[PDB]
């Protein structure tokens, strides 16, 4: 205990200097962040931790609030951080700490984790291409872009073979392969025919969006079966206490007909008679399970093996590609140290780098054999500078328009010395080929402009918010002018009769929220808007006269 003697000495003398805390810090902690966190911990007692020997009156003037419960929980803290050394809360320091825990990669380790990614997505495509309705969608997609509803060489990346005629060749390959398998289902070589049907697709080259569509469409056709596997198990083992060996034997393995369930309503058990609770429920799952069998050409247990090939292969490669992502985190931090002081915080530049680093891995091709630290350096050069372009100023500037200023910042700095004293704005019309107005609005744009806690200062500690005036308010001279104009109209319209005042109250919006038109006022009285226009012009001429306009003419600003 030394920091407890620091607490006791501070409350025993009414102050603390920097010398007393620096003599009562422990031996293990080094850097200045944590020790001024400790200064805050002792400073909100508050025992007035300031620099020098304090004055004489300012211990009796300075007050000690609030005894003692904040000091109770601070004693609970300060007698307990005398044990561990690794405590800080900074995401930058803790990010350096949890980033050093991942080692780098070699060249060989990089390409073999890349081929782990390649064989992982190959296992995913093995699970995809082992399903027929994806290739039925491929049939109907090539059919719908046979009418050129899309662009097929943009819908698929040609094929892995540039030309639509060879894209026609491999699709004429498909429909012949499809009919020598599906038409000859009637089961000896039919699954071998689907096998040859599966082989001809794994040399087709597509777009990931037109790849991900059929993956997620069978995903909702997968978890529906996983909902069916939930629909049985949530309502057999716990609903009725049917034992799971009746679930392990009867359902699990067969899964197909209406025999694993509806024959168990005669097992002479509590749960067997309790299946009448769930006989009508899973009869909806007795059809919709086999409806999926009407949508695969296979059985449900063969679907349970298809997505389990898909899930584990995805869980291998996405973990593999994150093992490549985690390895090159030391690369990204070296790049973001060069882009730091241009507006955005340090952790934000980094986290936009790992976003492109994840996207660089998805488009990295190790068959080219270049190093990965040359490919991902392009994306982090984009993604850091793009988020510096997109998300750094309080007023968002479009990305190219930043490059207009950045080219202007790069050129006008160069003509500051290559010309003489200053570069004029009209001189910059000569150097860059922007014609003196699309160069002028570039320099009209502000820069993260001014705070409104901006000290003016030394007036009343006044800030810049104290002197900005609102022009869009209502000054009470104009408002009482407007209010007295409301009553001065009401007395001039007291000098008119029933009809002419009322059209003049509904041609404009006088105590009604329109401003009807000439026919609309004439719609009320069935007049074809001509006498209504005259009786407006008659009453308007009636209000033109002196000693009829003796109050209103003064109401006009003259």
């Amino acid at each position: 205990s030394q920091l407890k003697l620091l607490v006791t000495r501070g409350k025993e003398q009414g102050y603390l200097t920097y010398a007393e805390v620096n003599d009562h810090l422990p031996e293990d902690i080094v850097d200045s962040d944590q020790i001024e966190d400790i200064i805050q911990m002792i400073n909100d007692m508050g025992i007035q931790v300031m620099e020098e020997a304090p004055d004489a009156d300012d211990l009796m003037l300075a007050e000690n609030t609030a005894d003692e419960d904040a000091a109770e929980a601070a004693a609970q803290v300060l007698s307990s951080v005398e044990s561990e050394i690794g405590r800080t809360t900074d995401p930058v320091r803790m990010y350096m700490r949890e980033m050093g825990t991942v080692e780098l990669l070699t060249r060989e380790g990089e390409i073999d984790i890349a081929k782990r990614i390649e064989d992982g997505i190959n296992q995913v495509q093995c699970s995809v291409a082992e399903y027929p309705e994806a290739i039925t969608y491929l049939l109907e997609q090539y059919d719908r872009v046979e009418a050129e509803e899309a662009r097929l060489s943009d819908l698929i990346t040609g094929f892995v073979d540039i030309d639509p005629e060879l894209a026609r060749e491999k699709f004429a390959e498909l429909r012949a392969q499809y009919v020598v398998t599906r038409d000859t289902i009637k089961h000896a070589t039919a699954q071998e025919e689907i096998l040859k049907l599966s082989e001809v697709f794994k040399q087709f080259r597509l777009v990931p969006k037109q790849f991900d569509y059929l993956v997620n469409s069978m995903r909702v056709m997968m978890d529906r079966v996983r909902t069916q596997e939930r629909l049985i198990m949530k309502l057999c083992v716990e609903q009725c206490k049917m034992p799971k060996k009746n679930f392990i034997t009867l359902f699990t393995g067969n899964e197909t007909s209406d025999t694993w369930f509806n024959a168990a309503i005669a097992m002479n058990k509590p749960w067997s008679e309790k299946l009448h609770d769930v006989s009508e429920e899973v009869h909806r799952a007795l059809q919709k399970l086999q409806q999926i069998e009407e949508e695969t050409g296979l059985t449900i247990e063969q679907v349970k093996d298809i997505n389990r090939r898909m899930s584990i292969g995805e869980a291998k490669a996405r973990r593999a590609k994150k093992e490549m992502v985690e390895a090159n985190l030391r690369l990204v931090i070296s790049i973001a140290k060069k882009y730091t002081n241009r507006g955005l915080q340090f952790l934000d530049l980094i986290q936009e780098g790992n976003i492109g680093l994840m996207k660089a891995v998805d488009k990295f091709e190790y068959r080219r054999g270049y190093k990965f630290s040359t490919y991902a350096t392009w994306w982090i050069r984009q993604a850091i500078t793009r988020s510096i372009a997109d998300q750094a100023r309080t007023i968002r500037i479009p990305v190219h328009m930043i490059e207009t200023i950045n080219k202007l910042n790069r050129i006008s700095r160069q003509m500051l010395q290559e010309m003489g004293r200053e570069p004029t704005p009209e001189e910059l019309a000569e150097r860059m080929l922007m014609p003196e107005d699309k160069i002028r609005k570039v320099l009209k744009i502000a820069k993260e402009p001014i705070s409104m806690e901006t000290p003016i200062g030394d007036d009343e500690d006044s800030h810049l918010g104290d002197f900005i005036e609102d022009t869009t308010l209502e000054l009470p001279l104009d408002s009482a002018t407007t209010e007295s104009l409301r009553a001065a109209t009401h007395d001039v319209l007291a000098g008119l009769t029933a009809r002419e005042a009322k059209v003049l109250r509904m041609r404009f919006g006088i105590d009604m929220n329109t401003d009807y038109t000439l026919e609309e006022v004439g719609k009320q009285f069935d007049v074809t808007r001509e006498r209504i226009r005259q009786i407006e012009a008659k009453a308007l001429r009636k209000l033109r006269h002196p000693s009829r306009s003796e109050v209103l003419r003064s109401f006009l600003d003259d």
Partner: protein, 46 residues
Amino acid sequence: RRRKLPATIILRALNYTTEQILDLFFEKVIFEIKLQMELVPERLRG
């Protein structure tokens, strides 16, 4: 303005030993035998 160290540490880091430090900062009346102390005539005041 860091933590304190006892200020003979800065003399020891400058390679001064204990007898050399006392050689610097003190005055030496010497005792001998029987039981004689040589006197400085001013040094007695207290």
